[PDB]
């Protein structure tokens with residue numbers, strides 16, 4: 001309908017598969033050429049510098065999160081205050097570092113179990129065998145939803161972050177058909193689970209959402225569904241890329257792999273530097289709520305504003321050694337989890353999963369990438385990850 005969400009449409013500067021697999025040199029060039037620019041092919045402003053990206057994310061009154069192509073903004077991701085505040089306050093205490101600490105041993109058990117399934121494999125796909133399943137199992141248990149067919153839910157979860165091949169009408173229609181398929185299955189599935197919990201509450205998050213009251217009324221079914229699908233998709237698609245991207249970097253630069261294996265206290269730094277350097281989410285969308293001058297650029301009420309975390313994370317005004325993977329950084333103020341009121345609810349959980357995933361792989365011993373694979377980027381321009389990544393223990 002040409003009101004298309006620009007975060008789903010690839011920039012024309014990113015063309016080849018090699019560029020999709022490492023777009024950061026191009027973002028860096030764009031940031032230096034013009035840190036804010038209007039892309040005519042996507043009808044949006046792209047923002048590349050750290051200070052302006054942070055400013056946008058910190059100013060929800062100026063830059064709205066209500067960017068659904070449909071009329072209804074369905075989950076807190078797409079809500080502005082005050083509604084955003086009331087719904088997020090329902091769940092914010094479930095996801096703190098203290099709230100999730102008890103899961104550490106259980107997540108270590110899942111990781112050990114998954115790596116046992118590949119101990120006497122020659123090589124294996126880190127995505128299918130480890131990085132994919134682990135976050136799906138964790139988020140399923142937190143939501144309270146059975147997910148025993150992980151491949152099925154992965155397929156449809158992936159559909160919900162898919163983008164268009166280009167800005168053609170046909171490409172957008174193909175993308176919307178994929179996303180529609182994921183909506184049919186995942187919405188249907190959670191509708192059934194919600195009905196089951198309505199009939200018999202359990203000790204799980206879905207049941208809490210059915211019990212909680214906002215303004216003296218229960219959540220609408222649409223509101224509970226929004227939580228379920230957002231938590232499922234955000235909880236697994238990104239984390240899988242965090243783990244895979246870290247394994248990717250550690251096999252592209254074995255110096256880092258060896259140093260962290262030999263000083264495992266560096267794993268939290270490795271997690272943060274993977275987020276900064278290979279961010280699972282490259283770009284965060286907003287809609288200008290009013291006219292806003294960002295420098296000389298005049299952004300008009302209602303225009304799309306795409307903030308490039310992948311570029312901000314390498315802005316040399318903010319980061320020393322921005323294009324170097326450094327596991328000894330004293331601070332790492334990346335925007336890979338966003339910033340401000342929508343700051344990732346799952347960040348403590350993602351950090352724990354990443355820490356455990358990397359630790360278990362490192363403690364199994366040295367590992368290498370299988371050479372002569374043709375990596376396949378995930379087909380969404382706001383995601384950074386590969387569909388498959390084969391490694392082998394030495």
Ligand code: HEB
Nearest residue numbers: 076077234235238239242280336337338342344345346350
């Ligand atoms: C569990 C769960 C979970 C998990 C695990 C996660 C994981 C993650 N994540 Fe998250 N998130 C989430 C859940 C989550 N998540 C939510 C729910 C949200 C929403 C919030 C609001 O909106 O407030 C987010 C949000 C978010 C954001 C912001 C956006 C805006 O601003 O709009 C970002 C960037 C992110 C990223 C991410 C990553 C990178 C990862 C990995 C690594 N996240």
Ligand SMILES: C[C@]12CC[C@H]3[C@@H](CCC4=CC(=O)CC[C@@]43C)[C@@H]1CC[C@@H]2O
Nearest residue numbers: 074075160161183187225226229230233
């Ligand atoms: C936008 C999104 C796909 C569409 C999802 C959205 C979560 C909220 C949601 C509620 C539904 O009932 C399905 C459609 C939507 C609107 C998802 C959050 C991450 C994912 O990319």
Ligand SMILES: CC[C@H](C)C[C@@H](C)CCC(=O)O
Nearest residue numbers: 007077233234281283284285
């Ligand atoms: C699914 C992971 C996050 C909830 C989504 C954010 C990264 C926003 C993505 C966007 O702004 O289109």
